[PDB]
Structure 1
Amino acid sequence: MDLYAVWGNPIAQSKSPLIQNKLAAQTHQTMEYIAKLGDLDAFEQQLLAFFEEGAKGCNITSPFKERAYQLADEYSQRAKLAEACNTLKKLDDGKLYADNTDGIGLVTDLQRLNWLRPNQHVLILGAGGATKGVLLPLLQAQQNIVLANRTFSKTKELAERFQPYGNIQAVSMDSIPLQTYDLVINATSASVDAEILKLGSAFYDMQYAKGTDTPFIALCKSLGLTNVSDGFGMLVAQAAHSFHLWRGVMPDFVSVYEQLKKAML
């Protein structure tokens, strides 16, 4: 029985196993996906033991993304840019391959929502690892990005890092250009001028509040904004992409998302 897992701390809350099981079912892939608690200190040793004992691959969530990336033998451009990895596959030759499907998951979910038209003007709030993990595929999807963060230096580093891949402007949080943004993405854990939010056409939170509105969506809703989404689809889509890397079959993202949402509600 092929073994996969999600590694994190905490991990008790993870939906990854539920999602991956449905993804396996849908594609009739024979495999099992479990949740693994990564020790804050021993994670590296535990992970390697996990692969030495024969696991085929795994997802990585907080706080080990960076750390997992450093462990890999080979990695994708996506992982390289993110300098972090949410997916590992132990290749047949023994190599540990890192990828980061967070960005393509985000792209895939926005496409489901029809919120990813080429040359959209997109505001992204936050410049932590989450943003860092999605910028490359967003830029590759011809999103013109205005990036703003509480801490300006990090905004500038990211704009500098991704400048070669498309249009991204770093701005101070207190000088976000007042314009209509086709899409605003919250990638904070976390203070945007409400006047900016009010002009926005669509609002996406990478955060997913199991069974409720995230702070960001609640905020948007309090300003009378209605075209909103949390990031549950992003969670399902990144999983589907990880699955595709492992299995060589692309699960039907929309179906599983729908079932999970049905499961969900």
Structure 2
Amino acid sequence: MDLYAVWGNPIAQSKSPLIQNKLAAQTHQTMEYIAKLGDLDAFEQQLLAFFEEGAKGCNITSPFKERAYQLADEYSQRAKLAEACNTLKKLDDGKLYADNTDGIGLVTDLQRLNWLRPNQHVLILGAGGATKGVLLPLLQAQQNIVLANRTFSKTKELAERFQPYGNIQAVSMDSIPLQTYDLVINATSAASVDAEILKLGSAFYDMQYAKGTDTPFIALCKSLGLTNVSDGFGMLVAQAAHSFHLWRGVMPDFVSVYEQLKKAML
């Protein structure tokens, strides 16, 4: 039985094991996926011990995404641009291959929703957080991106990095260009925008999801009469499927688990 794990701090909160084991059961894979708490100082050496032990790969969450990427021997264009990775794969020789599966999970979910038509204008609220891991694949799907953040320095540096891949610009959250947006993506944790701005959007995607209830962002949209909305639960299951495909060579059907899970929560 091949072992896999999600590494983080904290970790009890994770849904990856839940997702990944279901994906495995669904495709008759002889594997298991567990949750591993990484020590803030000792992670890297725990991680390497975990691989010597015989693990085949793992997901990485806060706060070691950047550190785990630094352990990779080989890495994807996605991981490179994000300077972080959420997925590691141990190759047969013993090399570690790193990829960042966030963005492609997002594009998949948006494609499911038919919210990723080429040449759209997307307003993204919030930088860093989950957005830098997501910009490259959005850009490659020909999305024209406006990146807004409360602190300008953050968006600007992010825009400079991704500029060679498409039309992307940095703006201050209070200085958002008064143009039509096909899609507004909320990255921010735990908003910061005036409502008319949101009334420039045709669609609203929160990279957050809440169990049962709506997220604060989605609640805001709905109270503004903006109904064409979605949370990011689909993005979460999609990322997981992509890491799974990289590890196993089999794309599990993305929808079904998303649904059973959708159903279970509500």
TM range (shorter): over 0.9
Deviation track 1:37-77 (CA, whole Å, cap 9, x = no partner) reads 11111111111111110000000111111111111111100
Matching residue of 1:18: 18
| TM-score, length basis structure 2 | 0.97
**1:92 Cα deviation (Å)?**
0.7
Most deviating of 236-245 and 179-188: 179-188
Hey, what's the Cα distance between the residues in 2 that align with 1:89 and 1:245? 8
How far the C-alpha of 1:18 sits from its partner, in A, is: 0.8
Q: CA deviation at 1:213?
A: 1.7
Which blocks of at least 5 consecutive residues in structure 2 are unaligned? none
Deviation at 1:102, TM superposition (A): 0.3
Shift of 1:169: 1.2
| Distance of 1:191 and 1:258 partners within structure 2 | 31
Shift of 1:199: 2.2
Once residues 248 and 179 of structure 1 are traced to their aligned partners in structure 2, the CA distance between those partners, rounded to angstroms, is 42
> Is contact 1:59–1:86 with CA below 8 Å preserved after alignment?
yes
Could you tell me whether the CA contact under 8 Å between 1:112 and 1:254 is conserved in 2? no
Shift of 1:209: 1.8
Paired residues, number: 265
SS at match of 1:13: coil
SS where residue 243 of structure 2 aligns? helix
Shift of 1:211: 2.9
Q: Distance in 1 between matches of 2:129 and 2:53?
A: 30
Alpha-carbon distance in 2 for matches of 1:222, 1:64: 37
- When structure 1 is superposed on structure 2, of 50-59 and 172-181 the one drifting more is 172-181
**Stretch of structure 1 that moved more, 183-192 or 93-102:** 183-192
In structure 2, the partner of 1:258 is 259
> Does the CA-based 8 Å contact 1:8-1:60 persist in structure 2?
yes
The Cα of 1:193 is off from its aligned counterpart by 2.0
SS at match of 1:216: helix
* Contact 2:85/2:98 (<8 A) preserved: yes
CA distance in 2, matches of 1:250, 1:161: 31
**SS at structure 2 position matched to 1:192:** coil
Query: Aligned-pair RMSD on alpha carbons?
Result: 1.1
1:51 aligns with 2:82: no
SS at match of 1:132: coil
